[PDB]
Amino acid sequence: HKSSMVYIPTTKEAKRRNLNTIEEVVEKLYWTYYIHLPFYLMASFDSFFLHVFFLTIFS
Amino acid sequence: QQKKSLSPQEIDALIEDWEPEPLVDPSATDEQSWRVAKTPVTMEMPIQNHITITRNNLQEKYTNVFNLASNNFLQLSATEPVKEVVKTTIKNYGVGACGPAGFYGNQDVHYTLEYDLAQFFGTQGSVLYGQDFCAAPSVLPAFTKRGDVIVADDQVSLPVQNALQLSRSTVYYFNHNDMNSLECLLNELTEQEKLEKLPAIPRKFIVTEGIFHNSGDLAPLPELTKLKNKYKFRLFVDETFSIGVLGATGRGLSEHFNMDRATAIDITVGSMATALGSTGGFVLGDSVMCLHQRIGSNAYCFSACLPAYTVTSVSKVLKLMDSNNDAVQTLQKLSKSLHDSFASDDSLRSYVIVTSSPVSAVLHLQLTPAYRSRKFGYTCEQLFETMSALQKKSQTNKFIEPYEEEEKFLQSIVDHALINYNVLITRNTIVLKQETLPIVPSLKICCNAAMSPEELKNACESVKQSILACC
Amino acid sequence: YTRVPLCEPEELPDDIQKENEYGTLDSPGHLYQVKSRHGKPLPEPVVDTPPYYISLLTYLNYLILIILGHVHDFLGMTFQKNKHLDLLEHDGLAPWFSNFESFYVRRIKMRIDDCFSRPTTGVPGRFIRCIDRISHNINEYFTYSGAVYPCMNLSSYNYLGFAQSKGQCTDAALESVDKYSIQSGGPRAQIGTTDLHIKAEKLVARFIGKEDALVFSMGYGTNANLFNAFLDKKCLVISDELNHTSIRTGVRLSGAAVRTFKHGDMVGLEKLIREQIVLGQPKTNRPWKKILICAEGLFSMEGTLCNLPKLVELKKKYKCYLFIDEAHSIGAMGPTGRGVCEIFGVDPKDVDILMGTFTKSFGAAGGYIAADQWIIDRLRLDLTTVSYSESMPAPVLAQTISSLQTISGEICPGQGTERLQRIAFNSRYLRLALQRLGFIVYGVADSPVIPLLLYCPSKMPAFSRMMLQRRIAVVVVAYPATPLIESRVRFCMSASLTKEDIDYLLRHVSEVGDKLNLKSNSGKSSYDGKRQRWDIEEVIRRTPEDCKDDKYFVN
Amino acid sequence: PVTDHRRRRAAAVISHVEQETFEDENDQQMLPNMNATWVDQRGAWLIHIVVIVLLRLFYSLFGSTPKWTWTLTNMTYIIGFYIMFHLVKGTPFDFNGGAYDNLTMWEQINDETLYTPTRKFLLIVPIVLFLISNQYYRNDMTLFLSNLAVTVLIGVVPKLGITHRLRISIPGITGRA
Ligand SMILES: C[C@@H]1CC[C@@]2(OC1)O[C@H]1C[C@H]3[C@@H]4CC=C5C[C@@H](OCCC(CO[C@H]6O[C@H](CO)[C@@H](O[C@H]7O[C@H](CO)[C@@H](O)[C@H](O)[C@H]7O)[C@H](O)[C@H]6O)CO[C@H]6O[C@H](CO)[C@@H](O[C@H]7O[C@H](CO)[C@@H](O)[C@H](O)[C@H]7O)[C@H](O)[C@H]6O)CC[C@]5(C)[C@H]4CC[C@]3(C)[C@H]1[C@@H]2C
Ligand SMILES: CCCCCCCCCCCCCCCCCCCCCCCCCCC(=O)N[C@@H](CO)[C@H](O)[C@H](O)CCCCCCCCCCCCCC
Ligand SMILES: *Cc1c(COP(=O)(O)O)cnc(C)c1O
């Protein structure tokens, strides 16, 4: 039984098998939970999230 | 002068006292059941010129019956080249589409036919529909809401009537093919609209038909185009019976008058089953119109895609019609001869009349009002007013005796010719309850491009003698 | 490049094509038989909810989208007008459509429009071929290239695998074409009717279990042009809030009064029936001429069944009428395939009118209505489609007759039962595995539609694109079709798929969901009242044996 | 006319929306509105508190006096709620034929029911916000008067038993029936 179908190898399983995960996870959490994909040209809204710099300074 | 003004125990008494009505009234079923017993049924052979039929539950059978009750005109779908395309598609695509329009439903043959229609009919785009009966009431409501104005003819068909009821807008009627009535009506509407000083201009439309389904007349397009531009209106034309039979090649009503469709007409509704030979329908227009129909039309959004073999066959027919135009010429010669054979007879002047144009491929016959009043003793104006009152009052039973007598008489004319001379001619099939505008019974004789002039001539003489003998 | 290419068919040996359209079973242990509920009523369904911050984030995202959309519209249409010439008056003529009535399509859906209207080619079997396209501007126009790649099918209405180009049905259709042409003369009243129409009607009436039935060309027209035949402005219609648009259009054309009751709430229905019987018509308080109840068999967006015995006893007690739609239930539900009536054991005589469609299971196009003798005899004279529309073509009739005969068992023995067992096992296994992984899955235990909830709006395009990159086809729906909080992905199972394909899909879906953090289960899905975060290997090893047992499903 | 479906624009100082006819009311309002159903749902009541807290924190990040911060947050919340609910008239998607073209979202809540718990909550929030906020600028009478005027004239008068289906032709000829 043979069919004309191509199987895509899975990442982390026979793709990478043959220090950076934390940054990727943090980036995904920041991006997907906020409204960015249905926006066009509005990547400048990330500049509005400069509150991290404002709260960085203490006393 | 203020004037001085229930228990749960008696609530169940009201419930028990309720007496509902039957779902369907069976009182008049027996008297009106002769229509089913007289419907011809073809036996194991395609509907063509010569057929073998059985009627009334296989009780009677006829062999080699000349057919004059088929809506197919060009007869190009029974040829060998089309059958080759149909069989190949089934082996490679199947029979079903299995999906809506927006969910993996287009199989890159639906796109091709859309391009072909625009190039053949000289427009910018087209949209396909599953059924022709559900095309007009699905496009008109999408472009009209409350507060709009629609001007319509007084002889439109039932599917057009359904669209105007669901459109939810003001509807006006003008006389059948009367530009004096149309021009007068438009002038008053414009003036009062200017007087009220509305913040925005509402949408306005004109509704008519190319060749009428119940009469067989035409529309004067050159007059309508001048008025719509003068008074800032829009034109809506239905061309179910006028595409493929009018014009040098068969483009439609615009080619007959030597005009351009891109400017004369705005919305065109057509059917692929009358002449092309495949199921479905289409709507023609510009680009902005089409994009709104992809999401604003209920029939398009909420239905499965049309099968594949129907689309492929029509494209082959359109290609064949472009190269050669011999099928249309044969059809027009027979149609003109048929009309003159029934209009130049002095023995049928006092009995029946003809209400069809020479360019029409279907001949309509109606009884003269003098003869109808002599025997049945009723008038069309009286018939219209009786049914209007019943519909408004919402009566369960809607039965009229003089109307039934005329239907039986016309059936006798049909039956007499078939038994004695083996010629099948049909009778107009309508439902009087659903109608809103006046209508009367009639007869129909059809024609196509596969006939011979000698055979048609003998059939015409037989029907003429059949009418005289019955009367 | 801009126009859609016409793909030349490929040349392949027969066996490869058969495997592409229909799979071959590996072991006889992947089949399940469906039992019948004699006296067990349907319990009230239970739903699960995510934590609060998901809802709060969704609300904030929608608020931002609305604010920026309205601001952009106002600023763009005030500071410039040359580009927006389709939304302003020109030479004294109003525009085609309005600005406010089409805000969502232009301002939210247009940025993710690449996930809708995907062109395909070939038979829609186990593997569906798709044409590639390149997005330009922001989903404005596309450029196509001559390349076609296969994808796993989870987005097509093919339950029993009847969409094949090699079999008895295709040969029957070709023979029908040889005998009867594709031409149809006209309306069924004039010339359209033939003997095959009578054969199909009688066979359908015998199969369903009623006395007689009719056939139509379009499913939409069956509902749109039916209610005006026996309803008027002095009748009441009680319908669920979740019904198809065809029923609503038909009732609107009829003109009867409409009152709706909440989904899955019989007490409210009884209260409404009592109040409407007592009060009567408005402004006059005369009694209603008749009362009709409308309902649907299986609801596709949720995969839940209607409670039939309750409706039957209510209509018998209060002297009402019942109307049942079986678009998604015929030929795929029950021990044999009769519908929900066979599932519940209710005799078909109780239901006044039955309806169905041949597109979802039998691989054709059409519809039917089944009722008693006198009702059909009157409706034949009183209907509009019969004497004003076209007639059904012959190949579709041949396909439908062959499919119904095959499922009944007259021809091709030992095929229909095997297909039904395959689809039942596949649905149960997929639902149980998805619930064990940690997701949220709606519906009854055996339902071909599996809705998976994806709450945040930004997670639909990402999931769809990642699944497409891994050669799996999915369908996503969102507001306003679904509630604002709940947006879902719908899975349509087939009898042509195999356990290996399910394992492949499960692995890829699990890893993608772990990447996107879509696992939110509150423990009410598990029958033991505990959270379930398992491994993929353990689920694959244990679920197929435990899939058959019915004690692992809450509903 | 055979249908007589027109929209009237009668001009008067005080006018009301006429009651809907049988066809428009008993038949064209049957399906869920999908514009006011989301109010009585999950998480539809804490979001106002979250918005208030976020606005207050955003203003405090600037580093201004408490009086200006609280006055600005009150005005912004009330103006935003007014713009969202009371100003616009209609619905962003076609319903049946344009049945809800004369009413705002506030009138459409709970099928034109006058007193429901959500309406009580929506009326209660501005008052409690005003009582909490006034404690910082009691000394300045002008700011107190301005806050009281904003609250009473925008966040109190529209949400009343009176002024239901009430239109004034001063800023434009309104449409009724
Ligand atoms: C310096 C400071 C900074 C801070 C700040 O202040 C300044 O910054 C400022 C920034 C400001 C915003 C800027 C802009 C908007 C959008 C606006 O609008 C919403 C959308 C529409 C809302 O719904 C209406 O519209 C329905 C439409 O159906 C109407 O429906 C009926 O009437 C139908 C009539 O047919 C009949 O069918 C039926 O009877 C029935 O359906 C009904 O009246 C009503 O519901 C209204 O607007 C649209 O509709 C207009 C008309 O079509 C468009 O066209 C018009 O604008 C074109 C522009 O080029 C010009 O050509 C022409 O004037 C003309 O064509 C316009 O573009 C377009 O926006 C609502 C206000 C808001 C948010 C402002 C708030 C205040 C600020 C936040 C200020 C903030 C505080
Ligand atoms: C950094 C600057 C400051 C940032 C702050 C910005 C302003 C926030 C202030 C708070 C505003 C009040 C908060 C109450 C709302 C709570 C959360 C609700 C979540 C969203 C709900 C979505 C509901 C969808 C229903 C769809 C519907 O039916 N829609 C319409 C027709 O019916 C409504 O007409 C429509 O929705 C409102 C249209 C209003 C258009 C806004 C125009 C304003 C342009 C921007 C100008 C600034 C405005 C703010 C001062
Ligand atoms: C799926 C479905 C339809 C679709 O019918 P078409 O044949 O695609 O027009 C119609 N009605 C109901 C109730 C459905 O579930």
PDB file of C-alpha atoms and ligand atoms in Angstrom, chain A residues 48, chain C residues 59 62-63 66-67 70-71 100 104 479 484, chain D residues 35 38 47-48 51 55 58 76-77 79-81 83-84 88 90-92 105, ligand 2:
ATOM      1  CA  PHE A  48       4.102  52.452  23.368  1.00  0.00           C
TER       2      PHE A  48
ATOM      3  CA  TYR C  59     -11.743  42.010  25.321  1.00  0.00           C
ATOM      4  CA  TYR C  62     -11.063  43.648  20.391  1.00  0.00           C
ATOM      5  CA  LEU C  63     -11.291  47.121  21.951  1.00  0.00           C
ATOM      6  CA  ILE C  66     -12.210  48.634  17.007  1.00  0.00           C
ATOM      7  CA  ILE C  67     -10.658  51.926  18.140  1.00  0.00           C
ATOM      8  CA  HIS C  70     -12.633  53.573  13.355  1.00  0.00           C
ATOM      9  CA  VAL C  71      -9.820  56.128  13.701  1.00  0.00           C
ATOM     10  CA  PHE C 100     -20.889  51.123   8.454  1.00  0.00           C
ATOM     11  CA  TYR C 104     -15.779  44.037   9.991  1.00  0.00           C
ATOM     12  CA  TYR C 479     -16.906  36.408  15.205  1.00  0.00           C
ATOM     13  CA  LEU C 484     -16.964  36.894  20.860  1.00  0.00           C
TER      14      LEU C 484
ATOM     15  CA  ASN D  35     -24.531  43.151  19.178  1.00  0.00           C
ATOM     16  CA  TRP D  38     -22.268  39.626  24.868  1.00  0.00           C
ATOM     17  CA  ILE D  47     -13.429  44.562  32.491  1.00  0.00           C
ATOM     18  CA  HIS D  48     -14.664  48.031  33.492  1.00  0.00           C
ATOM     19  CA  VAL D  51      -9.969  49.569  32.381  1.00  0.00           C
ATOM     20  CA  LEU D  55      -6.113  54.277  33.010  1.00  0.00           C
ATOM     21  CA  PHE D  58      -1.093  55.006  32.940  1.00  0.00           C
ATOM     22  CA  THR D  76     -11.884  59.726  29.979  1.00  0.00           C
ATOM     23  CA  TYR D  77     -13.870  56.745  31.265  1.00  0.00           C
ATOM     24  CA  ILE D  79     -16.499  59.994  27.582  1.00  0.00           C
ATOM     25  CA  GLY D  80     -15.356  56.611  26.279  1.00  0.00           C
ATOM     26  CA  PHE D  81     -18.448  54.842  27.597  1.00  0.00           C
ATOM     27  CA  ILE D  83     -18.973  57.335  22.663  1.00  0.00           C
ATOM     28  CA  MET D  84     -19.229  53.536  22.704  1.00  0.00           C
ATOM     29  CA  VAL D  88     -23.670  55.687  17.542  1.00  0.00           C
ATOM     30  CA  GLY D  90     -27.302  51.220  14.193  1.00  0.00           C
ATOM     31  CA  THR D  91     -25.375  47.973  13.803  1.00  0.00           C
ATOM     32  CA  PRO D  92     -22.136  47.176  11.923  1.00  0.00           C
ATOM     33  CA  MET D 105     -26.811  49.805  21.754  1.00  0.00           C
TER      34      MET D 105
HETATM   35  C1  LIG E   2      -3.628  55.959  24.867  1.00  0.00           C
HETATM   36  C2  LIG E   2      -4.810  56.921  24.959  1.00  0.00           C
HETATM   37  C3  LIG E   2      -5.886  56.457  25.929  1.00  0.00           C
HETATM   38  C4  LIG E   2      -6.276  55.009  25.696  1.00  0.00           C
HETATM   39  C5  LIG E   2      -7.700  54.710  26.145  1.00  0.00           C
HETATM   40  C6  LIG E   2      -8.679  54.663  24.980  1.00  0.00           C
HETATM   41  C7  LIG E   2     -10.134  54.771  25.409  1.00  0.00           C
HETATM   42  C8  LIG E   2     -10.579  53.784  26.480  1.00  0.00           C
HETATM   43  C9  LIG E   2     -11.495  54.438  27.475  1.00  0.00           C
HETATM   44  C10 LIG E   2     -12.517  53.499  28.016  1.00  0.00           C
HETATM   45  C11 LIG E   2     -13.674  53.332  27.072  1.00  0.00           C
HETATM   46  C12 LIG E   2     -14.887  52.734  27.757  1.00  0.00           C
HETATM   47  C13 LIG E   2     -14.665  51.287  28.152  1.00  0.00           C
HETATM   48  C14 LIG E   2     -15.917  50.453  28.112  1.00  0.00           C
HETATM   49  C15 LIG E   2     -15.722  49.228  27.239  1.00  0.00           C
HETATM   50  C16 LIG E   2     -15.060  48.059  27.958  1.00  0.00           C
HETATM   51  C17 LIG E   2     -14.467  46.958  27.067  1.00  0.00           C
HETATM   52  C18 LIG E   2     -15.311  46.531  25.876  1.00  0.00           C
HETATM   53  C19 LIG E   2     -14.523  45.632  24.949  1.00  0.00           C
HETATM   54  C20 LIG E   2     -14.876  45.797  23.490  1.00  0.00           C
HETATM   55  C21 LIG E   2     -16.291  45.449  23.168  1.00  0.00           C
HETATM   56  C22 LIG E   2     -16.511  45.263  21.694  1.00  0.00           C
HETATM   57  C23 LIG E   2     -17.978  45.157  21.388  1.00  0.00           C
HETATM   58  C24 LIG E   2     -18.283  44.994  19.932  1.00  0.00           C
HETATM   59  C25 LIG E   2     -19.729  45.229  19.583  1.00  0.00           C
HETATM   60  C26 LIG E   2     -19.881  45.704  18.196  1.00  0.00           C
HETATM   61  C27 LIG E   2     -20.897  46.810  18.016  1.00  0.00           C
HETATM   62  O1  LIG E   2     -22.102  46.602  18.113  1.00  0.00           O
HETATM   63  N1  LIG E   2     -20.305  48.029  17.697  1.00  0.00           N
HETATM   64  C28 LIG E   2     -20.874  49.381  17.405  1.00  0.00           C
HETATM   65  C29 LIG E   2     -22.364  49.628  16.912  1.00  0.00           C
HETATM   66  O2  LIG E   2     -23.347  49.039  17.715  1.00  0.00           O
HETATM   67  C30 LIG E   2     -20.396  50.400  18.404  1.00  0.00           C
HETATM   68  O3  LIG E   2     -20.732  51.553  17.819  1.00  0.00           O
HETATM   69  C31 LIG E   2     -18.902  50.457  18.487  1.00  0.00           C
HETATM   70  O4  LIG E   2     -18.469  49.443  19.251  1.00  0.00           O
HETATM   71  C32 LIG E   2     -18.355  51.749  18.998  1.00  0.00           C
HETATM   72  C33 LIG E   2     -17.802  52.605  17.899  1.00  0.00           C
HETATM   73  C34 LIG E   2     -17.005  53.720  18.507  1.00  0.00           C
HETATM   74  C35 LIG E   2     -15.914  54.187  17.615  1.00  0.00           C
HETATM   75  C36 LIG E   2     -14.786  54.776  18.401  1.00  0.00           C
HETATM   76  C37 LIG E   2     -14.322  56.046  17.775  1.00  0.00           C
HETATM   77  C38 LIG E   2     -13.271  56.727  18.597  1.00  0.00           C
HETATM   78  C39 LIG E   2     -12.005  56.994  17.829  1.00  0.00           C
HETATM   79  C40 LIG E   2     -10.833  57.082  18.766  1.00  0.00           C
HETATM   80  C41 LIG E   2     -10.834  58.372  19.575  1.00  0.00           C
HETATM   81  C42 LIG E   2     -10.552  58.161  21.050  1.00  0.00           C
HETATM   82  C43 LIG E   2     -11.786  57.631  21.778  1.00  0.00           C
HETATM   83  C44 LIG E   2     -11.532  57.416  23.262  1.00  0.00           C
HETATM   84  C45 LIG E   2     -11.450  58.732  24.006  1.00  0.00           C
END
